[PDB]
Every structure is written in structure tokens, then in C-alpha cells.
Please model this.
Amino acid sequence: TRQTTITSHFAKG
Amino acid sequence: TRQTTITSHFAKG
Amino acid sequence: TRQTTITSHFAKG
Amino acid sequence: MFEARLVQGSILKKVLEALKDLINEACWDISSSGVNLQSMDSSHVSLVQLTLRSEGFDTYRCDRNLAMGVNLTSMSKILKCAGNEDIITLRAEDNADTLALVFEAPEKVSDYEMKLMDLQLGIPEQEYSCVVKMPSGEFARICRDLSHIGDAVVISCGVKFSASGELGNGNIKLSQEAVTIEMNEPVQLTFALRYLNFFTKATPLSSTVTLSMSADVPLVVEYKIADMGHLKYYLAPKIED
Amino acid sequence: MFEARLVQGSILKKVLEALKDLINEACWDISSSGVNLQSMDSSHVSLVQLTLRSEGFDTYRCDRNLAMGVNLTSMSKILKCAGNEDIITLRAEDNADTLALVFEAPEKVSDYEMKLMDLQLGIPEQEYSCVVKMPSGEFARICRDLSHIGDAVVISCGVKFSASGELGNGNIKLSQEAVTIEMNEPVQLTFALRYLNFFTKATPLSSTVTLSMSADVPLVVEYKIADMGHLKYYLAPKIED
Amino acid sequence: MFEARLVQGSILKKVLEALKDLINEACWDISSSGVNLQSMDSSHVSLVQLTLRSEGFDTYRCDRNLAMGVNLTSMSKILKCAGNEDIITLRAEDNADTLALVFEAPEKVSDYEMKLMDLQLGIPEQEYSCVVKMPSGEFARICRDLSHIGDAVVISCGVKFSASGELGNGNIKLSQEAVTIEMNEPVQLTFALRYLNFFTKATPLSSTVTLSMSADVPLVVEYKIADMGHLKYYLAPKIED
Model:
């Protein structure tokens, strides 16, 4: 198990 | 005055 | 601004 | 020129107590509709979304929208100088280098100027396979307790919170003050307790908390701020290698 | 298979709060008569004797005797995950690698598995020249106060507690909520306050504490656990060189 | 031979809590008129003047004046062993190497001997342009709060307390439980909050505090000790370079 970045799930415009 | 070990008072029968 | 010593205000004499 | 009077100034104190240890610098979006703050944490694993609707303020005015870069710790320090029952007024001008915080005790008036800084991520549309409403204190106790057991919590949704470490493991089972579960599908997700433990610093904002889950998407921990709006934390999951 | 239900789970929480900072790993002797724990502290100056009678449990079952090696820190950590009003059930099987602790809130059920470790001293028969029964809080305050004065306490038995250091000295005199003294002989013994201060971590277990003394033998500080049994600390004295 | 019995020993406990972190060693001037203590702090920026009148003691006797050099930390430590409602008796003889402190619980009597040490500045007469009477708790909160903003407080006497640092600045304005201002001239003085924060450790001694100010002279922060006398702190100002 490894922590993922929020930016790898949510995007920018 | 010096601290003594509990094992110097109590034994293992 | 600089802190001053209490002895520079009060005396012994 | 922006001016927002808040009689329950404690709310803003609690809000910044909830954010100061998770975000260093954040931009406060001030608009006619109210105050908005959206910011990743400093670890880049979570996203905080704070909304204080203008209605929740006792007087609120914002002629033109304004984005105030704020050091949340410095704002935290300033808000710790507000009495817990003080009347807090926020005051900014256009091109402001400073946010004015005025604390009125209910014959002491404190005037603080906080230097502003110069300082992106979109929340997708998501139906959540599982939504859990529970007391905020119980949720904070769960994430506190399980962090003595391990670094990660597997949330299974009856909702089960399980952690494991060297010393052993633990499973915490809640079923339906109240705990309610709307489950459109069973979900099992793993999250770092360290960040959930940051989120629960918002526990004084509301007696209840909602956890929204779906497979392989960030978890939403929502604390509604009665009348004013809400404080939302999104937490990126841990994924199996 | 062993299973012991305890409704005042706080007792077990308090017990481990008392021991965790004095013993690292200890063996819990589980038998039909109840739970027994006897262990030297890590400093080898004291002996702890814990007895929880099976009667004190609300349900108690032990088909075959069992010696569970337990990391006491990991176990208190797990017990810190029990609500102070939870009902704690202990559960082990024969050849267990794990102790099961179940915390039932009075709609939250917590299930912990604590990894067990793999596995000494006999208590002599002793008549005590002097026995002092006193409030536990008063005794804890005495050993706290005198530790600001010195490292050693001279317990002279009216019972007098005396310490000396660089800063000066102090003598604390109690005579006969209540303080009672059964004195078959005057005794004067010297003990390290550091260990007595560990012992007084058991103060939440009992309103009173009994100190049993005799010349040149270990001091007994006994905290009875109402109904269940007792927590006994034996402290080797300091002797003059 | 000196002997002073004090029934509200808490006063002496509070007094030493008020001094211990500001003065290392101080000479207690004991005379028939009462107990006097006057001492610079270790930073040489402030002057403490403590006066406990003999009248305030319930029995007081001093055959011959005596100057006891006292380590205030050790005396504080000894007074932390006094119950908050104990009857404290001070006892010294001529040529004493020790001060006797006797704590009587209201069947426990504690007798402490504190080793004394071996053994300057005159307070001028000053009319104060500005004297401010306010609640002690309010003043401690002001110097606590402003210490989050900066190291220095600008006191303007309505009295205004202003601090500034990197993060911004703050102004606290009080006007006339009560706040009263006797102003013969407007004065504006700058002081280190670090020392004012030491001074407010005397806040438990009195509900109110008085600040005496005049241009280019030390600030007087006075805490009256009901009946017994007072604790006076003089703080050298910061001056502009």
C-alpha cells in the first residue's frame, strides 16, 4: 500500500 | 546509601 | 528600539 | 472594499485551528456570495474546501471579488488573540497588502493588521458509493485510537475501520448522536490516519461529520458549519502496489 | 480457550496505566482462579504482583492455564482505545499468538488482536513490623512532594517521610480518608522516590494504599482493586554503605 | 528568631510562583514591620519589590532584623509541597543557615528546612503621568496575545497596547472588572513583552493590576496582595536608537 497525491486524482481546468 | 536489587532479597525457589 | 537596563534608570548611592 | 462582521467569531477561530496545521499559505476567495478557501495540504495528499456563505455573516459586503493570500499560521496566531465570545470583523480593500481583523469584546477592542502574501485544483463531480454520517467526536476518537495501532485505516462500509501494525490490529464497527449509512455499493478504502487526524481538528465546528466514499476516489470528510457553510477535506487514498 | 468479560473495563485500563511505565514485557498467568501477573520492573529493584480474581469478572472462563507474554506498552496502547465506560472482554485460545480484546460501548464494537510474545521470582513469607494504611492520594502527594527535595525517602514509622537534597530537607509526619498504623516494631527504611512515584500511578485503582514495612526487607505498597483483587509493588530498600 | 504564621499559605505559594522564573537568588529582608523583598531580575531590566506587612500574617514575630539569601527556585519547589490550603509557618533564627517552612494541613504536618545562601538598588520617588487600573486577567491576556504579534508593546495612555512583527501588527484599546485611568499627561512607552509576561505570573495574587507610567522612566506593574501588601514590578523601557 502506498499513499497517492491528491493531484493524481483531481485535475486542473 | 545505595539501591539494592529485588533479586538480592527475593529468590527463585 | 533597544532594551535598557534597570540600573541605567535606578541608582544605589 | 470587503467587510464581514461575524458575531460568532469562535467559528473563525475554530476554522483556522482546523487548517493551520495542514496548509501553510492559502488563498481566501472573497466574493459577494461569501468566503471561499480551497487548498491542498502541504503534503499534497488532501484538498481542503472551506465555504462561509455571506448569509452566515451578520454583515457582509464585497464590492469586488478579492483573492487574499494568507499565511494560515499567522492568521491562526492573530485569531488566538480574539476572545472566544468576541465580535470579529474582517476588513480588506482592493490591492490590500493587509487584512484587518477587529475583535470586539462584549470595553476592549483589538485591531489587527495581517500582512497578506502573493500566492488551482478542481473538484470533480462524484456520486459517492457510500456516505456515512456519524458524530464528529466518535470519528475523531476512531482515528485517534487506530493511530495507536497503525499508520493506515481500511474503511469498510455497518462501517468498519481497521488498522494493523507491529503490535497487532484493530477493527472498529459502527452501525445505525446517530450514525447513518447510505450505501449504494460496498466500498473498502485505505487512508493515512495522520491526515484523518489533521481533519478531526475541525471537530469543534460540528457535532457530526460525514464520510463520503467511492472506489478508488478521494474520501470526503465534511464538517458543516451551522448556517455559514462547511469545511470539506478530500483525502487521496492509499493504493496497493 | 480463555474468555473474561469485565464491565468496569476502566479497571483494566487503570491497571495497565499503572504498569506500562515500569515493566516492558510481562507474562500474564491466566488460570481458573483468575488472572495473575508477577514481574520485576526493568530496573530490577521492585516486584509487581497483580491479582484479578475470576470472581471479579462478570463472566470468566479458562479451560486450561495459559501464560501470555505481553508487551505492556502495546497492551496499554490497545486499552487506550477502550472508552472509559466500555465493556472489555479478553479472549485467548491455547497456543495463541494473539490476545483478543473486545471493547463494547454501552453501537460501537472494537476488536483488537495484540501479538503475544514468548515468555521467575518467589515472594517470601513475611510478617511486617509496621503496616500503614492511608489514602492513596495523600501517599502519592507525599512521594511527589519529597521528590522535589531529594531522590531518597526515609520512611520512619505516626509515620514520618523524610528526604534530603542540596536545597534542604523535608519531613512529612502523618498520624491516625483515614490513616491507620499497626506497628509491631519501629522501622526506618530508605527507598528511591523514583520507584514509589511509579507505584503511585496505581492511585486511580483505590482510594487508599497500604505500606508494609520491616527491617531490611522490601517495602510493600498494596493497592486493592475493589472486588477483583490487588496490585502489589515490592520495593527493594536502599541500604547504607 | 523570626516566626511568621500565615493561614492563607496559598499567598506565599502564589508569590513564589510569581518570582521563581524571574529571579534566581534574592535576599528576603525580614523585619518587625514585615517581610520585604527587592531584587533585580537576572536580565537586569526589571526590579521586583515584594512587601508582606507583618499585620497580614496571623502571627508574626521578628526580634532582630534578618537578611536571608534565598534560592527562589528551591523555595518555590519547597512551597509546591504545601497544600493549597495549608497553614504555612516561616521560622528562622539569628545566624541561620536554614529557613524552616512548616506546612500544617487543615493529621499531616510537613517540616522543610531550606539551605540559605549568603547575600542594592534604590527606588526613586516618582509621580506617574499615567496610572491604569484594570483587571489582572485582562492585562495578562493582552501581553499574552500581543506576544504572538511581536516582542515589544507600545503602551499609549483610554490606554492602547500595540505590537508589531513580521506577520503584521495589533492594537488593543481599553477604556473605562473595571478599567480606570488617571492621566496627568499623555505617555507612550515601549516595553519587552517577555518581561511583562513574567510579571503576569503574579496574576493569581489579585483580581486587578495597576500600571504606572511616565515618559522615560520604568513602568510599574503593581499587584496588591489583599491585606498583606503588594508585589511591584518595575520594567526598564526600550528606547529608540
Remarks:
- The first strand of chain B starts at residue 2 and ends at 3.
